[PDB]
Symmetry: D2
Subunit: 287 residues, 4 copies
Amino acid sequence: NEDICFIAGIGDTNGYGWGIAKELSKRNVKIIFGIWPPVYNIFMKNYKNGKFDNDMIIDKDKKMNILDMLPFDASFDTANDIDEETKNNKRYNMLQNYTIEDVANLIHQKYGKINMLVHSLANAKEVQKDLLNTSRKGYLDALSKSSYSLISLCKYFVNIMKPQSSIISLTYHASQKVVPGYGGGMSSAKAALESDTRVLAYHLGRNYNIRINTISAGPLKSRAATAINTFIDYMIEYSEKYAPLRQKLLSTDIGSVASFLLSRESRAITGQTIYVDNGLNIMFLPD
Amino acid sequence: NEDICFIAGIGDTNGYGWGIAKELSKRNVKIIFGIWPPVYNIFMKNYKNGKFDNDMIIDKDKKMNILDMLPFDASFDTANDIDEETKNNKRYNMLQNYTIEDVANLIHQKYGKINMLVHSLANAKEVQKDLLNTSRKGYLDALSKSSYSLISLCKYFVNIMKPQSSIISLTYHASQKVVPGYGGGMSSAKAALESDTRVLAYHLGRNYNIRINTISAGPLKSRAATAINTFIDYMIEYSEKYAPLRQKLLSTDIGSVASFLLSRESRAITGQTIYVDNGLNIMFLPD
Amino acid sequence: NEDICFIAGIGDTNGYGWGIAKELSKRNVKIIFGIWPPVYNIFMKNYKNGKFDNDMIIDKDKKMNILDMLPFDASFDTANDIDEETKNNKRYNMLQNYTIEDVANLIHQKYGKINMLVHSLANAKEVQKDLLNTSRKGYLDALSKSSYSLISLCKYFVNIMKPQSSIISLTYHASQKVVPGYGGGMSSAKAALESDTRVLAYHLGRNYNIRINTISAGPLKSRAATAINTFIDYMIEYSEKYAPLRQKLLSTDIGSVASFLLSRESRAITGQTIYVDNGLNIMFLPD
Amino acid sequence: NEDICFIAGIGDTNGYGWGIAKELSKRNVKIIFGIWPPVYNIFMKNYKNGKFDNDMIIDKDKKMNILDMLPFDASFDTANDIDEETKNNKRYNMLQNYTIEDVANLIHQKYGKINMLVHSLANAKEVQKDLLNTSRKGYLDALSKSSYSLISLCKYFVNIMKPQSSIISLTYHASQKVVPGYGGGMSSAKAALESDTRVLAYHLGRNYNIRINTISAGPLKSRAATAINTFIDYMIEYSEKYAPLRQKLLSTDIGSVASFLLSRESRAITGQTIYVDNGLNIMFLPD
Ligand SMILES: NC(=O)c1ccc[n+]([C@@H]2O[C@H](COP(=O)([O-])OP(=O)(O)OC[C@H]3O[C@@H](n4cnc5c(N)ncnc54)[C@H](O)[C@@H]3O)[C@@H](O)[C@H]2O)c1
Ligand SMILES: NC(=O)c1ccc[n+]([C@@H]2O[C@H](COP(=O)([O-])OP(=O)(O)OC[C@H]3O[C@@H](n4cnc5c(N)ncnc54)[C@H](O)[C@@H]3O)[C@@H](O)[C@H]2O)c1
Ligand SMILES: NC(=O)c1ccc[n+]([C@@H]2O[C@H](COP(=O)([O-])OP(=O)(O)OC[C@H]3O[C@@H](n4cnc5c(N)ncnc54)[C@H](O)[C@@H]3O)[C@@H](O)[C@H]2O)c1
Ligand SMILES: NC(=O)c1ccc[n+]([C@@H]2O[C@H](COP(=O)([O-])OP(=O)(O)OC[C@H]3O[C@@H](n4cnc5c(N)ncnc54)[C@H](O)[C@@H]3O)[C@@H](O)[C@H]2O)c1
Ligand SMILES: Oc1cc(Cl)ccc1Oc1ccc(Cl)cc1Cl
Ligand SMILES: Oc1cc(Cl)ccc1Oc1ccc(Cl)cc1Cl
Ligand SMILES: Oc1cc(Cl)ccc1Oc1ccc(Cl)cc1Cl
Ligand SMILES: Oc1cc(Cl)ccc1Oc1ccc(Cl)cc1Cl
């Protein structure tokens, strides 16, 4: 009965955010996209010109249903946080209500309360450097955008969410085991995020009866995966060769798990890291 | 084609087996019950007598569709393995073809290939003794009926299963953290079950493209729970007071997760221990 | 043969840093203290006036041996990071060579290379708030001082350390399980630190043949423990009542583990979180 | 008083038992060997013949001081438990008092109370079969000789131990992550051992103030390793290539950790699985 989900983190149809949007669409959930300003206009132009029409197809006689597309920057908690330089940057100057709090309000004003929230974003200026070579600023940058954004998303979205709502984010196993190449303190950020998921599950469960979990996804060749210098090709080849299930991992494989976790079906699951990675995580060595 | 699930471990309607059966029925999965011989004839009597009618109600829609109900003993792998005493037993004498292999063959003969397997059983003759006071015979019994039974189930059932099939079992957090009353080597059995789940995931995944996972449930006042040392009333009271989600854990809460994990929706998840306990496992201590 | 250890984080003799210093002293390791400027002068004055003389006693006819006491701020990586305001702050104006890099150099110039390094510090402006109420600045503050400080300590100290050197830090179980009261993103910081310990173990082991581990200590009534608002009294009472070993946890209990980990005895252990907490961590519920 | 350690699981000098014996000897611990009857007389022959002389050398200082060497079978708890076949066996007929209880009594009769206990043994009749092809008899054998043996050891040995005593066993990471050749239910046995370590820690800690821990060792080319499926040459080659610390793992590396955990130095550590594998366990995949 009128399910509304806000997917924070979508710049195209090659990431998990898209896969999550498709699977939720299949379940008749109304989709609102939160889009980072640097790519917002290139996203809208593409969409308008029907460049994603093929990607919105679900099976046959069923195509995706996007309720809304909003500019969104998870760096900024409230309008008062936006530094003057960003406020007048070429790509930010034409946009408004793009902070975490302002999007929360905008959504509420326009559609009332929502019941599903997705954290599908991450960033680190120095992802290309290893932990040892990461500067304090670069490290704090990764934690701020990749980790804290989650806590902020919750602080502000819980006011516009109904009890028994569900919140998921996306993580990676480099938090628990060493993955060379996953630098800039991204591993640090994922560890924090998985730990924050537990602490948040406590507060949100007790105070609001809201669930929060995180999906630790396997490798997908998304735009950001390529920014890591290649790393992602190796990860994919390795996973397809050594995982219990040797099959290509699709963004919709994650989508359908996200979808389950966001629905009332998973009402007794909260605070968990759920692995959606073809079982790779359970392996010790290659064979 | 429809789906067929064999559920091994149903003795009444107050356990997880029944709850898993209910949820799969919502999805129109044809259900087959594996019933432990000692309680087979009383179960049949209660069923005939319409004592479960109410518990088989799904909603205005339809009622639980039970394909078949057969006697099943996880203590014996093949007909050869049954001893004199059991063969000579009041309850078993009147029944036949209840060993793991016999049941595989019988299901297959009658209904063909299945695609969903549920291990929802456990036993430990010395459950009421703490680990230090448990005998070798007692300890190996717990592992035999609660642990190996899973490996046996797989070995024999895989020949009668389709590719892309799915298997689940039930575990408890006592495997990972000390739970004082959970004796007799049940903690040990659960630890081995959770690890066996991984190894099996590797084997079944690579060789047959079949998934296996385990659900770590919170407390439910079932026939078996009632036997421990009351242990279960305490566990339930503690969970409902300190879990992130303060709400009654129902057998159907686990059922709906079991249903997801047994469907194609979770095609990318294998070898995992999913926690369905209202988030109790994430807590360090009472708050 | 001339063992030199730099303990970063010591404001008095009530914290772990002191306990680690005593146990290392007992092994004839030369001790250098790194002291945060806000408490440096009050520390020296106390020491000079023999206020710690009782605390330096080890058994009989054996008293602690402190090679040096240096002002140290783990907020600043190099002299170029120190903001002008701090540089002229009442407590910082009379001190110099107190950044991570400058202490590394100072130590090297004065004593040559060292072989043991201890990270025994932590801080968070908003420790009193829960994760949900923690601001972005407060969260980043905790990660910067509590987590990154470790990575920085390593980046700069590896140049002044011999191969087969050992590095330990101190962590807390709130990283893995929820501990209400452990706020400000300290839990976040500890999770990062435990994950960073693994990544660092990889780089330091391969490139320098240096080990790094972390001790997850139980509750101790240190100065900082009291800053958490009481929380620590509850933690201590709980631990003394429910831990496998019901005995008072002493700073020297941690000291002797640190000491082992820093010695060549632990040459095959790296990247690990070692629990020194009277076994509390292994418990699920109170009894 | 001096310390006495019983080491159960010595068959030659190429295993972990011997390495643990060497390191404890450095500390002047009096060593008692528990030797599996099938290899008792060849061990005695080799010893008399001075085949171990070289391996008993500690340094210019002193040589390994072995208090006693007795026949020990972890397959039998008491004299009553030995069957006809074993009683009738070539190797056993000439020996006596080799059951777990008999050995406890005999040590106690001869030397009094001990204070250090080492479980360094394992067995699995079907180790060369993968888990899916392992029989019930095979699986329960692995658990019986490799798992329960620990619980038995404790039950019987605690009466002959001082308060504040310490116990260790050896495990392998195959319990937590899939290691393809580690069959026969050895992975299962190790999983149960690691969990049993926690439960035992609770019981022994509260009731007797006794600690128990387990060491998860990396690969060592021992008699038993040589039997697996060569599995062990691969494990060793992989470990030496990908572990954080690229150096040969020696039995004495584990020995020195065992020695620490068995001393008062580790009074605050219990119920733990300590990893001594050069940090191999922290790696996700080869780099
Ligand atoms: N792709 C993988 O292999 C993989 C594996 C594990 C986890 N993940 C996780 O999945 C999530 C999505 O990553 P992806 O792989 O889909 O890449 P992606 O190309 O989808 O990028 C994520 C999106 O987040 C947006 N974003 C970046 N900074 C933002 C900010 N400050 N505010 C708002 N939005 C911002 C980007 O525009 C981008 O569109 C990430 O959290 C990532 O850590 C990905
Ligand atoms: N009830 C809980 O609180 C709880 C919490 C976590 C996990 N679990 C797990 O869920 C599973 C189901 O148990 P439950 O809690 O529903 O209680 P239950 O008694 O309803 O289920 C146990 C069933 O196993 C059957 N069984 C016993 N020995 C058998 C044998 N040798 N061969 C075949 N069947 C045998 C019994 O007939 C019984 O019906 C168990 O594996 C249990 O470990 C239960
Ligand atoms: N005390 C406990 O109960 C407990 C439990 C688990 C872990 N720990 C960990 O042990 C470590 C030591 O804490 P403690 O309990 O001994 O408290 P403590 O009173 O010893 O405080 C730690 C020291 O670090 C110093 N410090 C703070 N900020 C610094 C900076 N920017 N640069 C340099 N030094 C700085 C402080 O002056 C203080 O003396 C911490 O990392 C803590 O997280 C403590
Ligand atoms: N070797 C490795 O690579 C490795 C890695 C991790 C852990 N471990 C563990 O270390 C321990 C010691 O084994 P190892 O590697 O030194 O090889 P090992 O052969 O030297 O030690 C095993 C010993 O156990 C004894 N034993 C076998 N069955 C017995 C029974 N029923 N009763 C009493 N004793 C019995 C054997 O006589 C043998 O001497 C084992 O528990 C093993 O699981 C070994
Ligand atoms: O978490 C990820 C894991 C993988 Cl294998 C690939 C991509 C991932 O996602 C990111 C990684 C680094 C940065 Cl800076 C940003 C993002 Cl979105
Ligand atoms: O695992 C369980 C956990 C809980 Cl809290 C309650 C019941 C459980 O299930 C069992 C426990 C012991 C035995 Cl002998 C048999 C079963 Cl079916
Ligand atoms: O980690 C700790 C755990 C406990 Cl139980 C007590 C004190 C601890 O140490 C700290 C906690 C918070 C801050 Cl802001 C600084 C420090 Cl040194
Ligand atoms: O646990 C082990 C792990 C490794 Cl890598 C090598 C040897 C090991 O030890 C054993 C393995 C199997 C059996 Cl049947 C008996 C033992 Cl003593």
